[PDB]
Enzyme design. Structure first.
Site, mmCIF file in Angstrom:
data_model
loop_
_atom_site.group_PDB
_atom_site.id
_atom_site.type_symbol
_atom_site.label_atom_id
_atom_site.label_comp_id
_atom_site.label_asym_id
_atom_site.label_seq_id
_atom_site.Cartn_x
_atom_site.Cartn_y
_atom_site.Cartn_z
ATOM 1 N N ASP A 120 -36.875 16.689 -1.476
ATOM 2 C CA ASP A 120 -36.913 15.611 -2.263
ATOM 3 C C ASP A 120 -36.709 15.804 -3.567
ATOM 4 O O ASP A 120 -37.374 16.208 -4.386
ATOM 5 C CB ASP A 120 -38.344 15.037 -2.055
ATOM 6 C CG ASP A 120 -38.631 13.563 -2.636
ATOM 7 O OD1 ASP A 120 -37.713 13.088 -2.970
ATOM 8 O OD2 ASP A 120 -39.761 13.258 -3.497
ATOM 9 N N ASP A 163 -32.048 10.043 -5.534
ATOM 10 C CA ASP A 163 -33.089 10.505 -4.708
ATOM 11 C C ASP A 163 -32.997 10.564 -3.513
ATOM 12 O O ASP A 163 -33.049 9.709 -2.475
ATOM 13 C CB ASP A 163 -34.304 9.515 -5.027
ATOM 14 C CG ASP A 163 -35.755 9.740 -4.208
ATOM 15 O OD1 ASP A 163 -35.804 10.764 -3.691
ATOM 16 O OD2 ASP A 163 -36.608 8.657 -4.228
HETATM 17 C C1 LIG Z 1 -40.250 1.507 1.121
HETATM 18 C C2 LIG Z 1 -40.008 1.966 -0.482
HETATM 19 C C3 LIG Z 1 -38.698 2.313 -0.726
HETATM 20 N N1 LIG Z 1 -37.883 2.964 0.320
HETATM 21 C C4 LIG Z 1 -38.141 4.280 0.685
HETATM 22 C C5 LIG Z 1 -38.103 4.864 1.971
HETATM 23 C C6 LIG Z 1 -38.516 6.058 2.196
HETATM 24 C C7 LIG Z 1 -39.137 7.030 1.371
HETATM 25 C C8 LIG Z 1 -39.128 6.705 -0.013
HETATM 26 C C9 LIG Z 1 -38.666 5.398 -0.385
HETATM 27 C C10 LIG Z 1 -39.640 7.354 -1.147
HETATM 28 O O1 LIG Z 1 -40.320 6.883 -2.154
HETATM 29 N N2 LIG Z 1 -39.569 8.850 -1.275
HETATM 30 C C11 LIG Z 1 -40.268 9.876 -1.871
HETATM 31 C C12 LIG Z 1 -39.512 10.271 -3.507
HETATM 32 N N3 LIG Z 1 -38.708 9.088 -3.982
HETATM 33 C C13 LIG Z 1 -39.729 8.230 -4.810
HETATM 34 C C14 LIG Z 1 -40.956 8.830 -5.507
HETATM 35 O O2 LIG Z 1 -41.948 8.174 -4.925
HETATM 36 N N4 LIG Z 1 -41.357 9.876 -6.564
HETATM 37 C C15 LIG Z 1 -42.563 10.471 -6.615
HETATM 38 C C16 LIG Z 1 -43.050 10.336 -8.508
HETATM 39 C C17 LIG Z 1 -42.333 11.137 -9.142
HETATM 40 C C18 LIG Z 1 -44.447 10.339 -8.711
HETATM 41 C C19 LIG Z 1 -38.922 7.413 -6.072
HETATM 42 C C20 LIG Z 1 -39.356 7.578 -7.709
HETATM 43 O O3 LIG Z 1 -38.938 6.083 -5.767
HETATM 44 C C21 LIG Z 1 -40.599 11.009 -1.082
HETATM 45 C C22 LIG Z 1 -40.934 10.760 0.495
HETATM 46 C C23 LIG Z 1 -42.315 10.557 0.564
HETATM 47 C C24 LIG Z 1 -42.757 9.983 1.826
HETATM 48 C C25 LIG Z 1 -41.853 10.044 3.011
HETATM 49 C C26 LIG Z 1 -40.573 10.384 2.953
HETATM 50 C C27 LIG Z 1 -39.994 10.779 1.480
HETATM 51 C C28 LIG Z 1 -39.410 10.453 3.914
HETATM 52 C C29 LIG Z 1 -38.589 9.150 4.090
HETATM 53 C C30 LIG Z 1 -39.343 7.803 4.112
HETATM 54 C C31 LIG Z 1 -38.425 6.474 3.669
HETATM 55 S S1 LIG Z 1 -36.368 2.437 0.744
HETATM 56 C C32 LIG Z 1 -36.760 1.364 2.222
HETATM 57 O O4 LIG Z 1 -35.376 3.454 1.150
HETATM 58 O O5 LIG Z 1 -35.842 1.459 0.040
#
Ligand SMILES: CCCN(c1cc2cc(c1)C(=O)N[C@H](CN[C@@H](C(=O)/N=C/C(C)C)[C@H](C)O)Cc1cccc(c1)CCCC2)S(C)(=O)=O
Length: 371
Positions: free
Chosen positions: A35, A220
């Site tokens: 990630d 990301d």
């Molecule tokens: C539903 C929310 C948006 N989407 C989405 C989908 C999925 C994940 C994510 C985000 C998602 O948020 N992933 C995070 C890392 N990226 C974010 C983050 O939160 N960083 C943390 C901050 C620094 C405190 C970014 C800043 O938005 C890791 C992670 C966590 C749980 C499971 C999975 C990966 C496996 C895949 C599952 C699908 S989407 C449908 O693709 O648009």
């Protein structure tokens, strides 16, 4: 030795990509999510119905308690746990062993996924966004400081169950074609970049450049979709609807709620437009463009069925897996830049092609960054 790291990534569609790692002494094998959208290294360390296995600190002779709690909220899911350090290795990575910070996940909410084959997460971004604060050194920082592994890694994410490569410590030139094009990492927290132009089927969206990076734009690998700020998302959807007006869609589909299906082999790719994102380049007044096909933003989910993998965001642009797939992406931390090139695994379309093209001239690119 980079050949050993080729194809070291696996995963399920919409559930991220993972790499195999081992923690503790004797080594405990775990599959770890890759990630670039976070900076914490964390593993399941307690029973959970969705976990096949978990980190058992009592069975590790090299485990050290830091006696501090930690929680990390993601855009999807969150967990809390107990900080500690232990020995970490990557079997299909560099032949080294480092002592790293590890968050032992004791409690979580909608984080682990049912029938997922991963039990942890590897946050590859910088210390500024690490929890509880930036004093908790991220894994890759520990890796570089304790070894001679160069401060760089590459991700080759391949589409369809999925696969790919994480090249640690360098660039594998057999994994991409053409030239690498680099955009600056604007600030070291997320992997933030600047989008300076957007075109759909050759037509400029003609929005104020700031709208594209409203709040921010990040790369990301932990996010499935291409996520766009509200105003940009609406303009994009309206354009994509217009191009594919020859068919009408449930409309749940444009919100990513509903599937769309066609008879096997009859998906009308031609009615869906290509999308070009122009990124700030390395020299003054210079940019380059990456072009993605509908095969990328229509994620496959007995007909051929898809979900619209472009969605709305209130926290800026997120260039997720759909964007990264088909491209070789170099996270050149040492030179504060991110490189893009056409991947050796690219989706084939008879009439159109995903591309990384440059140079382009773009004036006043600094005005595109949000402030
Ligand atoms: C539903 C929310 C948006 N989407 C989405 C989908 C999925 C994940 C994510 C985000 C998602 O948020 N992933 C995070 C890392 N990226 C974010 C983050 O939160 N960083 C943390 C901050 C620094 C405190 C970014 C800043 O938005 C890791 C992670 C966590 C749980 C499971 C999975 C990966 C496996 C895949 C599952 C699908 S989407 C449908 O693709 O648009």
């Amino acid at each position: 030795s980079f050949v050993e790291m080729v194809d070291n990534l696996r995963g399920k569609s919409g559930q991220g990509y993972y790499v195999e790692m081992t923690v503790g002494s004797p080594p405990q094998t775990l599959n770890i999510l890759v990630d670039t959208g976070s900076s914490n290294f964390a593993v399941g360390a307690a029973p959970h119905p969705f976990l096949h296995r978990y980190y058992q600190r009592q069975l590790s002779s090299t485990y050290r308690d830091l006696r501090k709690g930690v929680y990390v909220p993601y855009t999807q899911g969150k967990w809390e746990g107990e900080l500690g350090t232990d020995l970490v290795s990557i079997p299909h990575g560099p032949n080294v062993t480092v002592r790293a910070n590890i968050a032992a996940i004791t409690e979580s909410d909608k984080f682990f996924i049912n029938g997922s084959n991963w039990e942890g997460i590897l946050g590859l971004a910088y210390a500024e966004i690490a929890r509880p604060d930036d004093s908790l050194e991220p894994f890759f920082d520990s890796l570089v400081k304790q070894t001679h592994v160069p401060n760089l890694f590459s991700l080759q994410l391949c589409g369809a169950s999925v696969g790919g490569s994480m090249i640690i410590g360098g660039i594998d030139h057999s994994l991409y074609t053409g030239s690498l094009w680099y955009t600056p990492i604007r600030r070291e927290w997320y992997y933030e970049v600047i989008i300076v132009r957007v075109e759909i089927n050759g037509q400029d969206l003609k929005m104020d450049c700031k709208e594209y990076n409203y709040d921010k734009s990040i790369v990301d690998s932990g996010t499935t979709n291409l996520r766009l700020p509200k105003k940009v998302f609406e303009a994009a959807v309206k354009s994509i609807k217009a191009a594919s007006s020859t068919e009408k869609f449930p409309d749940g589909f444009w919100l990513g709620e509903q599937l769309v299906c066609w008879q096997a082999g009859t998906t009308p790719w031609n009615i869906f437009p290509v999308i070009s994102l122009y990124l700030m380049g390395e020299v003054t007044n210079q940019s380059f463009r990456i072009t993605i096909l509908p095969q990328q933003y229509l994620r496959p989910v007995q007909d051929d069925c898809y979900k619209f993998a472009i969605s709305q965001s209130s926290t800026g642009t997120v260039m997720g897996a759909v964007i990264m797939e088909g491209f070789y992406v170099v996270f050149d931390r040492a030179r504060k830049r991110i490189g893009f090139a056409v991947s050796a695994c690219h989706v084939h379309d008879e009439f159109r092609t995903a591309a990384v093209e440059g140079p382009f001239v773009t004036l006043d690119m600094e005005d595109c960054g949000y402030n």
